């Protein structure tokens, strides 16, 4: 039973990548308002697990309630769109709020660049990997329509989670 959490600015495709992971397709316009957690069961690296993916959405709320719920997460998945610069810029802010609720400098996360399918690029693959070095995180480029990497990210995140419990 691992509890995952998917965050990133609206538009990157947090709902897109999650549905592909579970339902295995690619909704081309999932509502950007709805937030839901999906429970799936899979055998990751020989461990028949259960991944509860919480697909986050909505406006910022720094209440004691959204923090407590977000703190339940054991590994986070800060996605960003490689055609949206802001998405990347805001990555800093997403990482930092996670640090605070998890009460540590050390927290299980992996960056994820979604929408690699798209032709034009603003954020180049290069800067993302090096920023990931600045943090300690595996970077994984991903595509929600081509489905590439979708699984690895969602798996490598849980590898880190298992590592944290050692």
């Amino acid at each position: 039973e691992y509890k995952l959490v998917v965050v990133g600015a609206v538009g990157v495709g947090k709902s897109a990548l999650t549905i592909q992971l579970i339902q295995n397709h690619f909704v081309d316009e999932y509502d950007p308002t709805i937030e839901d957690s999906y429970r799936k069961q899979v055998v990751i690296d020989g461990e028949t697990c259960l991944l509860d993916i919480l697909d986050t959405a909505g406006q910022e709320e720094y209440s004691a309630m959204r923090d407590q719920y977000m703190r339940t997460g054991e590994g986070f998945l800060c996605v960003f769109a490689i055609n949206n610069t802001k998405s990347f810029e805001d990555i800093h802010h997403y990482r930092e709020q996670i640090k605070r609720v998890k009460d540590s400098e050390d927290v299980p996360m992996v960056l994820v660049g979604n929408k690699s399918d798209l032709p034009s690029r603003t954020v180049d693959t290069k800067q993302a990997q090096d920023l990931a070095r600045s943090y300690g995180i595996p970077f994984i480029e991903t595509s929600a329509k081509t489905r590439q990497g979708v699984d690895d990210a969602f798996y490598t995140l849980v590898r880190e989670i298992r590592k944290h419990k050692e």
Binding site: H93, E96, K99, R100, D103, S104, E105
Partner: protein, 148 residues
């Protein structure tokens, strides 16, 4: 509205917390309503890069004793806005405690609070000894000192 509070500037200001004490530091943020919110601690000698915002008020305490620490030779820290992304530095340091407050510190770390009254000391000291540093009472005093 409290006088010791942070301002919701929503303006990022990258700051360095640098623990130059031998105490485990507990950085405290005073929220927009003035209430003290703790944050992750810092071992002795440790330096960490913190994301905070302009106008935000911090104070720093021994994590276990809640004893008082200083930052930049004053007791509060409020970052300005950054200049050319130069980080704002926050050097935390033991203040010079009075020999009496030092001695209360040591004796509280060696005897549990039940055995204060079994010590061969004048009874004023028992009242002092169980007067543990409390941050809520240092805000009350600090706010009143903003008399300036």
């Amino acid at each position: 509205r409290p006088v010791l509070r942070s301002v919701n500037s929503r303006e990022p200001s990258q700051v360095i917390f640098c623990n130059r004490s031998p105490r485990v530091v507990l950085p405290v943020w005073l929220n927009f309503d003035g209430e003290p919110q703790p944050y992750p601690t810092l071992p002795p000698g440790t330096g960490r890069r913190i994301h905070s915002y302009r106008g935000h008020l911090w104070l720093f305490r021994d994590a276990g004793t809640h004893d008082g620490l200083l930052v930049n030779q004053t007791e509060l820290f409020v970052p300005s806005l950054n200049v050319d992304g130069q980080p704002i530095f926050a050097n935390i340091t033991l203040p010079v405690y009075t020999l009496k407050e030092r001695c209360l510190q040591v004796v509280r770390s060696l005897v549990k609070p039940e055995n204060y009254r079994r010590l061969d000391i004048v009874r004023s000291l028992y009242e002092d000894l169980e007067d543990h540093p409390n941050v809520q009472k240092d805000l009350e005093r600090l706010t009143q000192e903003r008399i300036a």
